[PDB]
Design a protein around this ligand. Sequence first.
Ligand SMILES: CNS(=O)(=O)Nc1nccc(Cc2c(C)c3ccc(Oc4ncccc4F)cc3oc2=O)c1F
Ligand SMILES: CNS(=O)(=O)Nc1nccc(Cc2c(C)c3ccc(Oc4ncccc4F)cc3oc2=O)c1F
Lengths: 262, 264, 275, 278
Amino acid sequence: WEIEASEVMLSTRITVYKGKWHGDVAVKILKVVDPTPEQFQAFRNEVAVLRKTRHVNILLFMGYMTKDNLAIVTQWCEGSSLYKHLHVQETKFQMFQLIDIARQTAQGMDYLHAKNIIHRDMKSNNIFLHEGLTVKIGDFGLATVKSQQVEQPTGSVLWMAPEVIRMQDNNPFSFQSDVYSYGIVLYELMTGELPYSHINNRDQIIFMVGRGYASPDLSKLYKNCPKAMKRLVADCVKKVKEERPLFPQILSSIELLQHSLP
Amino acid sequence: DWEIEASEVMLSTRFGTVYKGKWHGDVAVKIPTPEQFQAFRNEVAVLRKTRHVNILLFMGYMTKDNLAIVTQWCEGSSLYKHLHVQETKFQMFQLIDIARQTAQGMDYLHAKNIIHRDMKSNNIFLHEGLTVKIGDFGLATVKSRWSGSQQVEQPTGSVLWMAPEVIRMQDNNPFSFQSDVYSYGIVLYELMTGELPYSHINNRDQIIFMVGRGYASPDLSKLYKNCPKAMKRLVADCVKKVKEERPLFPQILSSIELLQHSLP
Amino acid sequence: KVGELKDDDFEKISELVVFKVSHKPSGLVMARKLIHLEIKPAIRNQIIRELQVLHECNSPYIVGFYGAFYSDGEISICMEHMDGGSLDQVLKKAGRIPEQILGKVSIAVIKGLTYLREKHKIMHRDVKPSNILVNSRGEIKLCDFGVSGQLIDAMANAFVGTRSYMSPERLQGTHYSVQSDIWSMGLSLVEMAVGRYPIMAIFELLDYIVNEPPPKLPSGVFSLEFQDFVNKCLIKNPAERADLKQLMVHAFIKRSDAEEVDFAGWLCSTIGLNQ
Amino acid sequence: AFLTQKQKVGELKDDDFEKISGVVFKVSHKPSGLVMARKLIHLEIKPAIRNQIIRELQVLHECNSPYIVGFYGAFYSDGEISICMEHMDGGSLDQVLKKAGRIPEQILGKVSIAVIKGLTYLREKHKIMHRDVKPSNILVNSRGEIKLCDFGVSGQLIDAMANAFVGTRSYMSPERLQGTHYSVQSDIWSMGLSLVEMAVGRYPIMAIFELLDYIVNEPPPKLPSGVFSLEFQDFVNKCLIKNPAERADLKQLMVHAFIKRSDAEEVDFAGWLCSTIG
Ligand SMILES: CNS(=O)(=O)Nc1nccc(Cc2c(C)c3ccc(Oc4ncccc4F)cc3oc2=O)c1F
Ligand SMILES: CNS(=O)(=O)Nc1nccc(Cc2c(C)c3ccc(Oc4ncccc4F)cc3oc2=O)c1F
């Protein structure tokens, strides 16, 4: 998957650059003057994961770059992120296509778990709503295949798991952390506001979640929703990892609740 | 990417009508003799290289039991149905967008050194009627420095899209970039007119002899008066009987983007 | 006796694409041929309307017709089952075809063409031994002819057709008539006469047809009037080719009609059947 | 004398500035020849939120003191929030802590005097708390004045910044970490932690949750009695009381003896920094 520098023209900048190569492409270039070999092995791990992913719900990898600064070539998504649709512009979504988004991204994470991939960074900025109907999952820089001490967490503290935050295990990252992150995505999806909005302190949120005192509030869910959906929302946010359900049962519940509409 | 699937897909009934399956969403499935194995490994070999938004996304293969190829399930109809079955009232911007998407997919395939050899409007699907998908790579190939050594087989398809040098078969390997350029030119004719070429002829052998001798060409007078003049020039000179005079795909994309940006 | 036809009324028995079927209320065996068409619906309605034309086509030399219908995206044509098979299958099984059988099949095809001319004013256009059938009772019928031009226009895309017995003058688009069918009949009679094309891409065959004259049979293997018959059937000039009234007074047709041949017994010996 | 320097600088635009050397950069205005400090903050928020934030950001104009970093203006450009302030050439004390390793005790006394006077000034005039007292937020110049910066002035901007940087070191009081009542005692706790941190140069005892757990369940570390005089340990143990009820308020930081004897000392900070740089 070798691409030489002279065919990719860097057209506009929106780090990330909108380029032109056999079509509109999005180029994730890491402009670092002194590349450490840690970034080298991170880049090799990223491209090694991206070569194993071929699905309609995953942002499509096409190629990489080696000389000058390291860059990643993928397709150019048209539209905006789910964070930008939900908390920046506030598009008035209707119920049906919200459950459609839920089942599509659940299908994407189910395919990632079937292909033995842990995304590890599931949040709203990683959800691209491509022409308003199709979902894409990208930015696999922290994706890792299971097969040592885990690296320090770097993402936002909202979508992390309590066992991620207290990190008492060498490798607390697993299927169920992604399940809880998907549950938080569902939480913001059915309400439209970020969880723990009444708290404006980062370390307070970290400590209150780590000690298990804090929890998302389901009171802002409208009561015209079917009770199976709120039961699913309550089940997917459960703190202890051994009773959080797996993605095939989630997909089965979603299609079961979709089927019942007359 | 690669690797084999399992019995997760379901068999409903033990050229049909539907071969649709279910494997993490809607998917499309294709279908021990040696002649099937040659084409099957050629299909998987060409499909491991294709990653593009205009190309049909290969998903996996199955070698156990019957030979199968699983790919994504597109929503919509083929382009042939859209022009000759339902007669959808397309606007001109949609047709030019379809032409530039197919040109972009061909430019990617030829830049990555791939010949499908087998264009027609049957193999072009409109995904939700918006984005093109090019598929059915059963007769695809990879060019090489030894590709001229091997002798190509009979295409046995439909003679309306093949090139005169193809239908003559005087060279050892009549296929090249320009044969696909001619087939794309017939596709441009079908987009800009709406009917099959050589409509006044109702004999295939008549078509074979009358085109293979260089005595026939599609009628350029059936193009609409409100078609772009550069579009008429493009479809005219990509169907030239001379193999060398047909322009390459970068020229075609440049002309199409020039005519798109020229329109107010 | 056979009324309307539907898909559920037929039971698949065997393959001859052709599936041998039977109609359950009636109990007679028919032959059902399926063709795949990607054609507009109203056009297929017209295809049904002028495939109803074959109701008045009855003769001892034309395959009987029962009905036609459309189902499951496939056009369904139904004809009388007629078990002796085509001359291509008989040619593969028997190896050679003797000259008196050649005279009988020539008489059959020429009388069928005269019947079609005098009763329907249409033509066959596809003379090749796969389209002539033989019955166990010795009658030689014709089928697969061009009855409705919309169906030719619809089928004008896919043919497989590695070879071609098409007339030379119908390769550049000149005037055509029954003389082209006579010429293709000459090619068919010569083809089976020897059992091979006695001389390889399809365009080379059309080149071979158009630019240089057809071959001659040796005089030592067949009687002289047979070579006279075929060389009158293999004239390149459309006007110089003998028409139907000329072949009905040729010496070969009167000697073949004067001959009494156990054609039914010989074909039953060839297929090895005991009713 | 610094007031008239803003008076000769009119409108500020992004095209009139140039790259020289969130994220913080320095900028200069070419005819004036003065140096300004630019702070760049990235937020993905509503337009109305951005405008009420900038409407809360104008207040820094009336925040004028020799103990508070001066202010120029703030505006919006390229999906970013720009904060313009007046430049300290000496940088924050964290960088000179990494440069020197340790700081002489009278310098910490002068820093303590400056920060407590700044806290008194801020609580008298605006009645607001700093919320972010750490050595990266305190600045010095080549002249010798020590000023506070990047305080919690805009609650909507605090809500916007509530989730961003991960947190490697934390200097925040326990009583706000439980979510209970917090006051200026939180800033006093943070000040005490900052001064002991620059006193010894490193944290004398891990992921961020471990520091949070250690802070909530255990008393803070204390200095040895055999090294320094008992009055400085008295300073730090009055500043490191867990319960804010008996934790010392700013008045008995003012009448505390160490602050008075440090005020009595004449410490020339400019001469020592010029000896440090050369
Ligand atoms: C290749 N040469 S060409 O290019 O001239 N094309 C064509 N030539 C000749 C004909 C046609 C179409 C045609 C076909 C093939 C056809 C087949 C079967 C049929 O059933 C029966 N037939 C006779 C008796 C009883 C029946 F039940 C009716 C048919 O009627 C038709 O019209 C062509 F397309
Ligand atoms: C950990 N405690 S917390 O959870 O409360 N988080 C927060 N703590 C404290 C503050 C804030 C927000 C803040 C920020 C960061 C800020 C930064 C610069 C600024 O410019 C200047 N400032 C002073 C002098 C000159 C200037 F140019 C104004 C600012 O104003 C602000 O409001 C927090 F989010």
